[PDB]
């Protein structure tokens, strides 16, 4: 079995300059982008990350050529949704790095 590795990047609002008007922190005024700079990227609406922190789950493989996925399982997750379910459902919103390398 393969398993997921978690990368904790800290407070999801870190790095943005906070304006007095909090609505300026929402999309489309702010956005969090996740990219591998190899053709894959995903714009996240920071407010819809159901967690105080931005956590990224890495998944991979040892098959015929390179394949790594970067997920934000908390994105658009209902609060009652389990971690297992979040991870499962996150694949269609993930950075799929499948350049063969």
């Amino acid at each position: 079995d393969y398993e997921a590795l978690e990368i904790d990047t800290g407070d999801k609002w870190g790095g943005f300059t906070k304006d007095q008007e909090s609505k300026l922190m929402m999309y489309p005024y702010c956005v969090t982008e996740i990219t591998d700079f190899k053709g894959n990227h995903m714009n996240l609406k920071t407010e819809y990350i159901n967690n105080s922190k931005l956590k990224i789950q890495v998944r991979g493989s040892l098959g015929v050529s390179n394949k790594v996925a970067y997920s934000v399982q908390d994105y658009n997750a209902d609060s009652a949704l389990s971690g297992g379910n979040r991870l499962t459902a996150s694949l269609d919103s993930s950075l799929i790095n499948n350049n063969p390398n």
Partner: protein, 108 residues
Amino acid sequence: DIAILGGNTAFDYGNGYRGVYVIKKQLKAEYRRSLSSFFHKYGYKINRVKKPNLRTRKAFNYVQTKDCFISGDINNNDLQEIRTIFDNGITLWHTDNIGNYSVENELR
């Protein structure tokens, strides 16, 4: 396919993706509150020619028509006004607590 001595099967199986998934989605709390409150006060868009619902809810009924037909033994000026009133939309209250929108206002 698996090698002999088209897609990355190892990544999928190794990470537990097989079979079919049912993912259920609904709109965010913010829009649920927004729309729910609107429907609560003003009902739904109907776009039907039918007799209007006047007293089908316990507390209040909102009614808005277009070009409504209303008859009766009434002088025509007053009858014309009544058509106009429902064509502009009106809320018919069925309890004395008029204007209190907090209540459930369930059927019957």
